[model samples]
Target: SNPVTDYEFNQDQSCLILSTLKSFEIYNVHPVAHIMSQEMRHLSKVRMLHRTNYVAFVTGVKEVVHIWDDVKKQDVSRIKVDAPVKDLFLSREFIVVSYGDVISVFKFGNPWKRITDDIRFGGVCEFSNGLLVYSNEFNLGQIHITKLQSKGVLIKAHTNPIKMVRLNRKSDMVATCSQDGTIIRVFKTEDGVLVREFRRGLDRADVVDMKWSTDGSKLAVVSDKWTLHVFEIFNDQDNKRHALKGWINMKYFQSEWSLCNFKLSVDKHVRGCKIAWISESSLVVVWPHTRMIETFKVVFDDEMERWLIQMDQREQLMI
Candidate 1:
């Protein structure tokens, strides 16, 4: 896994998986140790089941999806779709795959797909038990979050074409950012209401990754501008009360800005793709090209108006 193409952490953020052209690696983040590497010719997308030995991935040009057990090094299942797979999700009870306009769900040990639905068409998709969030096929800037068997509420999430969409680990909320990349919006999954928004910055920067803390109260965002932003979404002092004092949809003031951020890659200008919280005020970030990993903590400044990060505990990962 010399040049990692993609990276993801399991539910508890205990294991990190790095996907590459020839193989994918699992690392124990707590000890910063390599656990194992699974070989695949073109491992493009992967999702781990919590912290188990099971993973669901789309490879072989993404037409075939495989559920593999790392410990046994055997295929638990193989899935074939009519078109190239777009995304994959794995949980203890289900393996979800999206291809073309349809999303398929299969019980982990069952080969036959248990549930399938047409999304009209597909751009991107994220899944969790009982919920499916995907780009609305009719509107690029909008999205739909539906309970598996029901028609979803169409959320007009952004003014520009969306660049990223993700569901919180709890599946209660969805986060989306447009191509503009200036604002990240959160919505209630059950009702499609605008819950909150976070302003990344005034300038346009590509947001590489966004992750919610396990409880969904905070979000960490990574941008190519080399900034890692952490926002506590549900802070009592910074909340919907501001909207009552606000005028129009001037998101700069209407939204919450990052209380703290760290400029991650000054020398290398590396693409920061993934991030996860290890605690309420501490987290780890990953840079794929450089194989860089850094652990840092955020604490309130003396002024108490903003937050600051400590120096990085940097390591050149051995993958």
Candidate 2:
């Protein structure tokens, strides 16, 4: 196989089909694949949220939610969440979402107002499972950790302009990365102790996202450099934490020689964009609207399917 040059997966489809930006193509997941269907030009800026059975395409300026019927091959219905949706996460029974200062939790087949009024969360990251981590977007760098079931406030973690917070699989630990060139700090959920803080030597790189692996052995981080940085992490039996092991850096920058721009194309700025780690060593990095999306296929025998599961599991619960 030529490494799937033109498709992003929609796992909600039973066959795990791919949705392509070019020509608006959808590929059937098979040895001998075929085009599923296509949409009109209006299908731009589309983000897919996969539930267990269906894939919801959140689109348009008004944030219209459309459910793609797998068997029907068409949008069943369009649910409008009154305000412009900033972010949306698909849950089993409801959609936990964030739009501006107000947080909304909405369920399917129910009136939008009914679901949105129940939660009424001010800060972000509400509707927890086993972990109780919430953010104070009102303040720049504050996150609260508590037991989701008991609604007990456990610990309050702080950072400098905190951009994102992610809890591990078991909900026993959390990792928060800051944009102020501070260290990536991991905290214990039970007692709220600072376990580990890993720093990036470079100052300008801002941390955007992070997640734990299936076995909870490693954590992957994405920064402004559009590079994937993997760190090895483990807990000590004696109640001490360890720093990250040697990291794998997949950096992408425009070659400063080719001139195809208004001025000097690739040689001008050497711009770099977003990077996402598909697995432990392998990564997928994009140079924004410039070049082809690069995939760094590392030689390590890491379980990519397991890693995807871990990432999607949290995505299903977040907005």
Candidate 3:
């Protein structure tokens, strides 16, 4: 039984990369064709650059991550951190490795090295514009953005340790959430100004995944509470929806809810979940544990004043 162990997407979301016991396979999301697969029988995690043949993987047996040029069928480089890696972000301009409450960055040819400490949840990921953003240690509330080799601007994210940070495809806006995972704030990277704030839920839950729509007009948030939520980013009348309740002057009444949500069943025992936008209004979700890919279409309803979610397809992909 070759079950998928992990799943990731290329930066542009045009392809999906999967990790299994036998190999790492990259597939074009639309045609669902087998584009490429490296038969690394011992591999556990794999990530790719945008539509490029370059891929990086780490075997559970080693602390080093190998970078391979799939197109040339050769080893491009390796990063031996000598510590367990929590995650990796690969971009054209940088190679970022997060491990043991710290982060190390690498820029090819012109090498650069720097480390940030005491980070939680591997608070580092590649931004759309090839920059790096993460939260500072101990302080926890400050998010720092930097180029490959220097200190850059810092934005205040939250009082609690940050749980997740994501950027839209445009590289113009970024989203941040705290370990509390209750609230999410979007800010313009241009000026680090708050653009929008969304309440994932009133109750506390771990925010596992947050994906921006292809158009950057919507966001889909997945949490541990067995619910998937979608929010409209460019809403002009959101304030109007809560004007009357705003007078209550209470956070409970002032919170903004998702435009729609799809409930996941605890009975499924889902793990290794991955999500991506198939189109402006459709989404595809995968559960590697189940070896199933499901697609859904979300539509707006005038009566409910929210989007309606409906499953359109589900299929098993045997590795």
Candidate 4:
């Protein structure tokens, strides 16, 4: 079996958390704390609470999610689910868990309490502010955005299964990508309005990951095609308007977003990649399969009136 290894940086980028099948460790450019669990049957997935000391991991064999307080070096809470947790999202107040068809929210405290259970949901979800946005299983391409105890809005986003869903920093916007991975759509959370859309390409590809910039003005998309697409999200007077004259026209949208893309040298051994904004103008790309990290600086070329992305540095991670 392939060893499971995941790495995430803290909000301030002051430390990094590395998780493996047998242990979890924190490092400040180097290993600082190492934790090994005797009761954990298998560590399948792991996530860190933004800007906080809490980290969560799901043990597939145990069918439980463990919340660890890294600052105190102790297990703060553990919640047992009906099945192995497929994904997790941590907000300031709640820990959202996905169990394939059912999504549950748990409050963080002495005893973790399951607050709500949303059934018939896909295995992907994201949280921002007090809002929870998850994919609807019954309608694979649809999404539901809900605030606790409030009526949620259901959005028919695509025809195929939604590959990814993301909420902006303010929770006012949501972005979704489908399995086809050619089109990425952004919507307004309050009204469920289709705000903007962009085309990745004409051919189908697997969108490995999508992330919104800290200010929500930019989005980065990584795909299996060995490409990184950074799109500037904005509306202007020059935006093009298209009329949906028929069923085939449904995919058309009017937008003025410019796509800045970078293609990697073809490498069949590269299995997957992820990207994140290090600063407002810099991004770091992680290639897990190849154990490499690349950093890029993004700048606007005033002469060209367009955004330019340049590779700044590259390093191999000691996994």
- TM-score of each predicted structure versus truth: 0.84, 0.60, 0.83, 0.81
lDDT value, residue 128 of candidate 4 = 64
Off by over 4 Å in 4: 1-4, 8-16, 27-41, 60-62, 235-258, 265-267
- Better model by TM-score, 1 or 2? 1
Please give the ranking of all candidate structures by TM-score, highest first, separated by commas: 1, 3, 4, 2
Model 1 lDDT-worst window of ten: 235-244
Candidate 3 lDDT at 125 equals 49
lDDT of each: 0.74, 0.46, 0.73, 0.70
The whole-model C-alpha lDDT of candidate 3 against the native structure comes to: 0.73
Best by lDDT: 1
lDDT by residue (tens digit), candidate 2, 1-319: 1121222333222122223333233432222235454453334333334423355555444566665665566775566655666555454455555666655556654453335352333355633343446666555466766542213443345545666676665667777765665567778776778776666555346654565654454666655454455655652113213323535343323221111101112234434443344444344433333433444432322243112211111110000
| Residue 184, model 1, lDDT | 86
Q: Can you write out model 4's per-residue Cα lDDT over 1-319, one digit (the tens) per residue?
A: 3343666655443355555666665544222223322223366777777647788876555468888886687788888788777767776677778775788888877557876655557766776678888888778889999886427888999888998888776789999989876688999999899988888764356888787776777888877777777876752223224344543432323344435777765368776776677566777776666656677777766468566888877775543
How large is the C-alpha RMSD of every model relative to the true structure?
5.4, 11.1, 5.4, 7.3
Per-residue lDDT tens digits of candidate 3, residues 1-319?
Answer: 6878678988877788888889888887764667776677778778888887788888875678788888798777777875787678877776778777777766642343333332343354445566667777666667876655324667887888777788888778888888866788988876788888988665466877888888887788877775788877874223343435667532323226688878864345666477788778888777777766777777877567567888888776545
Q: Ten consecutive residues with minimal summed lDDT in candidate 2? A: 310-319
* lDDT per residue (tens digit) for residues 1-319 in model 1: 3577778888678888888888888887765788888777677787788878888777756698888888898887888887898777776666677788777776767654665544453476777655777787778788878776425677899878888787887788899998856788998888889888777775367887787776676788877776777777764233233343575342423337886767765565465557877766667877777877788777765457466887558886676
Worst 10 residues of 3 by lDDT: 109-118
Q: Tell me the spans in candidate 2 whose CA falls farther than 4 Å from its real position.
A: 1-37, 43-53, 108-133, 145-155, 189-192, 235-283, 286-319
